[PDB]
Amino acid sequence: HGVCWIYYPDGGSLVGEVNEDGEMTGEKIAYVYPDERTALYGKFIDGEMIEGKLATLMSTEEGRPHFELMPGNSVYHFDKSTSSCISTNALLPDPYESERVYVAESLISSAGEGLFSKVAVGPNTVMSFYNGVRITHQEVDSRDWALNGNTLSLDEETVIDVPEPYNHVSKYCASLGHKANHSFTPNCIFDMFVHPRFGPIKCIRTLRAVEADEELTVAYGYDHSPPEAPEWYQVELKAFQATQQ
């Protein structure tokens, strides 16, 4: 047998020998992150990760990936959030994200914490994942802005949220996308991402090269002509507007 690779639009992939029905089912299946090097390798059923052990893709020979397992016992499984459960392992970090970003005090005035790059990367680089509980637009839109600091629209049916107390990294650090602050001149964008542990979510992707220890920012993209937005954003929107005559 040969081997099949199935890529998502985001650059991640599933790879392995498929079974008789072309399904990613077996004991030597892997999800490979968009760096084409960090991998979760092990038991999958029809492409769902049952037990993925942290591995590094070392080479590919005739299309077949050759992995080395990382030391430790870092194991992961498909664990999609619900409306009330953000994660079965809130303190288990994503191994790809952990190498790319860290949380620290923001450089933006009075903005609390922010998300920073650990290393220099090029444009179009996935940096961080925005997982959270999955609730409805009705609930979010019909409640006060003070509850809506971390809400992210996923699609026409679902909003992802990281509600208190999970907005503190001491309580939740499985993903960190909710820590990226807003800018009207951002260095990153949100993009759809299909994650083997979190399921369909969004990620933070650079739109240009970024330096080590640079703060990562995204345009929150609130509706300016409904501005349906929190106060700090309205205050900052007028400034942005001033800057370009």
Binding site: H137, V140, R143, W145, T151, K202, V218, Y222, D223, E228
Partner: peptide, 8 residues
């Protein structure tokens, strides 16, 4: 929409 990144 009181959430980040909604498509209008």
């Amino acid at each position: 929409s009181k959430s980040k990144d909604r498509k209008y």
